[PDB]
């Protein structure tokens, strides 16, 4: 059966400003089936309090979800999203870049 790989974007709600409160986002989209594991990471470690949007889908039937958590960026803290899905042989890790 159909299996489509998630597109993954990791980004902040607001333009990042060090020491200013914000939300870290990981948007996954274009995937099928809907079972997906998404973690937000701080310095390589799983952030505990992460929420997500209600599962929905596009006209082509592929699913999308937004995972998000409060965060205050600093100069040195590194963030990433780690995604697993049936289409991925190993978890896919995308690093947060404040200009992407």
């Amino acid at each position: 059966m159909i299996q489509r790989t998630p597109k993954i974007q990791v980004y902040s709600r607001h333009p990042a400003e060090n020491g200013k409160s914000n939300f870290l986002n990981c948007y996954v989209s274009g995937f099928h089936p809907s079972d997906i594991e998404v973690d937000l990471l701080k310095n390589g470690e799983r952030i505990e309090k992460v929420e997500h949007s209600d599962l929905s889908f596009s006209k082509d039937w592929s699913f999308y979800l937004l995972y998000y958590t409060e965060f205050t960026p600093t100069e040195k803290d590194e963030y990433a999203c780690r995604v697993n899905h049936v289409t991925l042989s190993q978890p896919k890790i995308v690093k947060w870049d404040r200009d992407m």
């Binding site: 159909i2 489509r4 974007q9 948007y27 099928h32 929905s56 039937w61 937004l66």
Partner: protein, 275 residues
Amino acid sequence: GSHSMRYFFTSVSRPGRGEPRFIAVGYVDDTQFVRFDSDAASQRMEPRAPWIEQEGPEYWDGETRKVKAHSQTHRVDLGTLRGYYNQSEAGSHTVQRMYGCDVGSDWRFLRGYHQYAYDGKDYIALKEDLRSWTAADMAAQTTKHKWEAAHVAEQLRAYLEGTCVEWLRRYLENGKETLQRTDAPKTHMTHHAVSDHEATLRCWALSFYPAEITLTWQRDGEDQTQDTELVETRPAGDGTFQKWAAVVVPSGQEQRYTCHVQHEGLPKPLTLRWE
């Protein structure tokens, strides 16, 4: 302008792990306003926009009753489709359903939709005439027969042309602050040297609504489609959207390039340049 209301339903079988997972969501345009999750404690339809919180218990009890019925339908459907496709009891499968209505800038009915997918592909869909059915394959032709004999399309047509659009207009008025609004993109550009002889120009659109936007780069006025990195439009989390488009430019040629932004919230399309 034009508006739409859409409901989306997903059910996923969980053999050996209880009843199928069912999730329903409702949107007006690009704004979610209700949800139901089978696995949540409340077992009720729940508000997800502030303007719908004003509807009374009679609305919420009614939506809860109807959404449970949508859930039941999918539970039956999963078993039916498993049968039709001769599939085993072990595997997890997905049924999706979408329906809704469009109104034009006059707020009058424009178009209706009602569509089903099994395991990620079209199963059966109501045609645009709201009177006939498109069956994706041999199994769906059986459903089509059943539905034609039960006059299912007639009942859907009456909803899509009537109550769908009446409720859409009600929501537009009750959520006027949220729904009849546009948030124009806030734009900027960044420049980042990727080597001694190339630089990335990134053209940003932030905090816009609705999601529809066109972001393009030109070089000497010529479209740079095949040379532009364009990310999918993405939700900010606060009801607004973001997007960017980037070109790698030879260092020294920055002035040849223009970024063009088209969005309903703009008074005129924008042209941005790095100096």
